[PDB]
C-alpha cells in the first residue's frame, strides 16, 4: 500500500548524467498486472520503466519505476507524481515528490591534509584526507583522480555528512585515500575533486604532493681554515 519515492541523488546525477527518479512501491500484497508510471506537474504520462522488480522476501510486493527526464525539468521545481495501479487498491496511488527546496545553499570549501610524518615512519601506508566543511545541503560527491584519471571506489573511503558542531544546517564530510609510502615519496600528485550544487561551476578540486609544504632550506656551510 506504501509508495516510497527515491529521488535522483546528486551522486547519481553527477556520476551517470542520466538522472532518473524511482518509484519504490513497497508493501503491497503480491498480485500480478502491476503498471507503474510517472507524471510531471502537467500530469501527462512518461516513458515506461524497465527492470521490473520481484516480490519482496517479506511476503509482500516491492516494485521500482524509473523515468529518465530532462534535468532542467527536474530542477524547475515541478511536482512529479508516480501513478500506481493494483487490484487491492480502491484508488490508484498518487505519490508526489519534488525538490525539498527552501535551504540556504553554501559552497563547500575543500582543504586537503597530507599524512603526518609520524605516519611516514613505518613506511607502510599514507592516508591523505580531503576534509570538506561548510556546505549545504547534505549532499556531495568526492572523487580521487591521479595524473588526470580517476581511481577505483574501493581504494578511497568517504564518510557521511555529519552536522557541524558550531554551524546548524551546515554539514561536513571526510575522505581518505591510502597510498603506499614510496609513491608519496616520489612526489606523485593526487587530486581531490568535489561535486556539489552550490559550487559556482558545480565542480572544484585541490592538489597535493610531497613538495606542497616544503619551504626553502638554506643549508649553509661556513669554513675558515
Amino acid at each position: 500500500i506504501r509508495v516510497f519515492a527515491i529521488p535522483p541523488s546528486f551522486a547519481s546525477i553527477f556520476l551517470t548524467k542520466s538522472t532518473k527518479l524511482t518509484c519504490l512501491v513497497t508493501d503491497l500484497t503480491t498480485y500480478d498486472s502491476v503498471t507503474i508510471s510517472w507524471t510531471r506537474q502537467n500530469g501527462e504520462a512518461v516513458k515506461t520503466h524497465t527492470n521490473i522488480s520481484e516480490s519482496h522476501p517479506n511476503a509482500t510486493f516491492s516494485a521500482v519505476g524509473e523515468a529518465s527526464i530532462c534535468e532542467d525539468d527536474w530542477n524547475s521545481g515541478e511536482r512529479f507524481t508516480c501513478t500506481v495501479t493494483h487490484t487491492d487498491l480502491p484508488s490508484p496511488l498518487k505519490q508526489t515528490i519534488s525538490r525539498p527546496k527552501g535551504v540556504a545553499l553554501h559552497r563547500p570549501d575543500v582543504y586537503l591534509l597530507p599524512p603526518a610524518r609520524e605516519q611516514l615512519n613505518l613506511r607502510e601506508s599514507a592516508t591523505i584526507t580531503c576534509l570538506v566543511t561548510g556546505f549545504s545541503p547534505a549532499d556531495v560527491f568526492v572523487q580521487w583522480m591521479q595524473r588526470g584519471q580517476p581511481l577505483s571506489p574501493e581504494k578511497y573511503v568517504t564518510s557521511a555528512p555529519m552536522p557541524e558542531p558550531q554551524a546548524p544546517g551546515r554539514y561536513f564530510a571526510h575522505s581518505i585515500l591510502t597510498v603506499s609510502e614510496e609513491e608519496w615519496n616520489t612526489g606523485e600528485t593526487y587530486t581531490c575533486v568535489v561535486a556539489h550544487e552550490a559550487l559556482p561551476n558545480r565542480v572544484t578540486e585541490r592538489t597535493v604532493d610531497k613538495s606542497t609544504g616544503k619551504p626553502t632550506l638554506y643549508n649553509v656551510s661556513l669554513v675558515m681554515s
Binding site: 553554501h106 561548510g134 554551524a167 551546515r170
Partner: protein
C-alpha cells in the same frame, strides 16, 4: 593603502555603524579587528555565520546592493577599545582589507 578614518564617541547604549565598500556580487566580505599583541588582523565577523565569542549577539550585518554599502552594526559598545577595524573581502583575510578605520568609545 587607503585610510578612510571614521570615528565615534561610543558608550554602552550607543550603536555604531561602519560603512564598507561592497566588493559587489559575493566574495566573503568581512570585518576584521587588528590584534595589537599578534601584530596582525583577527576576524570578528564574516559572510559565514561566524561571530566572535565576546561579540556574540552584539554585531549584525546589512548589505545594500541598492547603494553598494556594507553596514556593520554594533548595538552595544563598552570597554572594547576601538583599535583598528578593517573591511575586507575574499578568502584570505590579510590580503583582502581596505577601510582601515579606528574610533574611540569613551569620547
Amino acid at each position: 593603502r587607503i585610510l578612510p578614518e571614521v570615528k565615534v564617541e561610543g558608550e554602552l547604549g550607543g550603536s555604531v555603524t561602519i560603512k564598507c565598500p561592497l566588493p559587489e556580487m559575493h566574495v566573503r566580505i568581512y570585518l576584521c579587528r587588528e590584534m595589537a599583541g599578534s601584530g596582525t588582523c583577527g576576524t570578528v565577523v564574516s559572510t559565514t555565520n561566524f561571530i566572535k565569542a565576546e561579540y556574540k549577539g552584539r554585531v549584525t550585518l546589512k548589505q545594500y546592493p541598492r547603494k553598494n554599502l556594507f553596514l556593520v552594526e554594533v548595538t552595544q559598545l563598552t570597554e572594547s577599545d576601538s583599535g583598528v577595524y578593517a573591511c575586507g573581502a575574499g578568502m584570505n583575510t590579510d590580503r583582502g582589507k581596505t577601510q582601515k578605520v579606528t574610533l574611540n568609545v569613551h569620547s
